[PDB]
Amino acid sequence: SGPVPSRARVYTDVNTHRPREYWDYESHVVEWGNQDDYQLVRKLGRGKYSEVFEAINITNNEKVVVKILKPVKKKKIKREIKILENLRGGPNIITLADIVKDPVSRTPALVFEHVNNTDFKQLYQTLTDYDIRFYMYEILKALDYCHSMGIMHRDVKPHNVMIDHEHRKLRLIDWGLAEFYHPGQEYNVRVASRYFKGPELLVDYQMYDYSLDMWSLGCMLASMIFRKEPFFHGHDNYDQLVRIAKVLGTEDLYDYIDKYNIELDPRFNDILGRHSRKRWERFVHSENQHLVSPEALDFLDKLLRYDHQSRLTAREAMEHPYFYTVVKD
Ligand SMILES: CC(=O)Nc1cc(Nc2cc(Nc3cn(C)cn3)n3ncc(C#N)c3n2)ccc1C
Ligand SMILES: [Cl-]
Structure with a gap:
């Protein structure tokens, strides 16, 4: 055996x-932005620990995809961030546009290219x-x-x-x-x-x-x-x-x-x-x-x-x- x-x-x-x-993603420090800079437009779906929306960046009117990270461990949140940031500029890999938190609920969200x-x-x-x-x-x-x-x-x-x-x-x-x-x-x-x-x-x-x-x-x-x-x-x-x-x-x-x-x-x-x-x-x-x-x-x-x-x-x-x-x- x-x-x-x-x-x-x-x-x-x-x-x-x-x-x-x-x-070593657990030790990675995250500088959280603001979700208030994004206007949600419609719901795109959901994952095991996520709710996804098509949104708009208020400042420049660009379409964006916002993934709200529903109760998950911050260990897994930081792992997804670290992987996305390490792979940024990679061919046919989705770009992470921003890392945010809701001003009221403080729930974390990842902003992607549409x-x-x-x-x-x-x-x-x-x-x-x-x-x-x-x-x-x-x-x-x-x-x-x-x-x-x-x-x-x-x-x-x-x-x-x-x-x-x-x-x-x-x-x-x-x-x-x-x-x-x-x-x-x-x-x-x-x-x-x-x-x-x-x-x-x-x-x-x-x-x-x-x-x-x-x-x-x-x-x-x-x-x-x-x-x-x-x-x-x-x-x-x-x-x-x-x-x-x-x-x-x-x-x-x-x-x-x-x-x-x-x-x-x-x-x-x-x-x-x-x-x-x-x-x-x-x-x-x-x-x-x-x-x-x-x-x-x-x-x-x-x-x-x-x-x-x-x-x-x-x-x-x-x-x-x-x-x-x-x-x-
Ligand atoms: C976000 C994520 O990790 N997973 C995910 C993703 C979706 N859905 C879409 C749809 C569109 N684009 C889209 C589809 N439609 C009809 C309109 N516009 N995009 N674009 C870029 C991205 C990204 N990233 C993304 N995601 C739903 C559910 C989940 C869980
Ligand atoms: Cl896992």
Whole structure:
């Protein structure tokens, strides 16, 4: 027993090599601004510990997104601030415009750049073979950047990908679950949306790294090119691994758990059983043939792997023939 240790293949000691101020977010001092400088316009939605609004900066009339941080620990507030500030000026990463507190309730809020988003449910239906490779390369620039900066996003999903299609502009948002990578640290597996959770989260292997975001991206890719959102549609965390297993096959799931000496949660051992690998070509039909190519299926196969150490890194993902000629490099 005892899980086998794992280290990130890239950007391993990146935080160990920067001063405390960089990654020791609890000790970071926040200079809170005023929310009274912002006029809220309409409610955009909510998170686990957040309420989101589209607002206006009174002084310059610019549209802005205001995320009120509902009862959370100030530890997590400071972590999101620190990640956003470290990643500012990064490609396809949302810009943190201000850090504020309400004058009356004193509740903290983060102010972001506004993106004129089209809901993925109406947008993906409209995307071309080129569009998908373009947007996928843009998500990867954002992921290679934050991974190179020592941060795991940990919640890569269509709702966290703001796309202004008309302007062909993409922003990776909600760095509210993002964490700093530290070699040999065991992270909380109760992160990400059910559908995009990596098998490491599902099997409860805590010593995961940057490669988690790579699995979620592969999930986003599958829903697009096959026109099936979400691609892996479990009704719970146990049924999620069952859906994955029915596609990737159990041979590799068991080789994975055996390799890292993962003690599966016992409820798994009653529902997992044995499944043969389903080839990606099985998901290819008449309606999505225009989005599919041998290189799309190869790229996808290299991301959707159980073994986190076997998935492509964001740099390798960008070097793939899937993106040849899509961008300059
Ligand atoms: C804020 C955050 O961390 N997560 C989040 C985000 C939203 N929603 C939007 C919508 C738009 N843009 C938008 C969409 N629409 C129809 C109009 N304008 N933008 N833009 C930039 C950003 C950012 N950051 C953002 N967020 C809802 C809920 C949550 C939890
Ligand atoms: Cl956490």
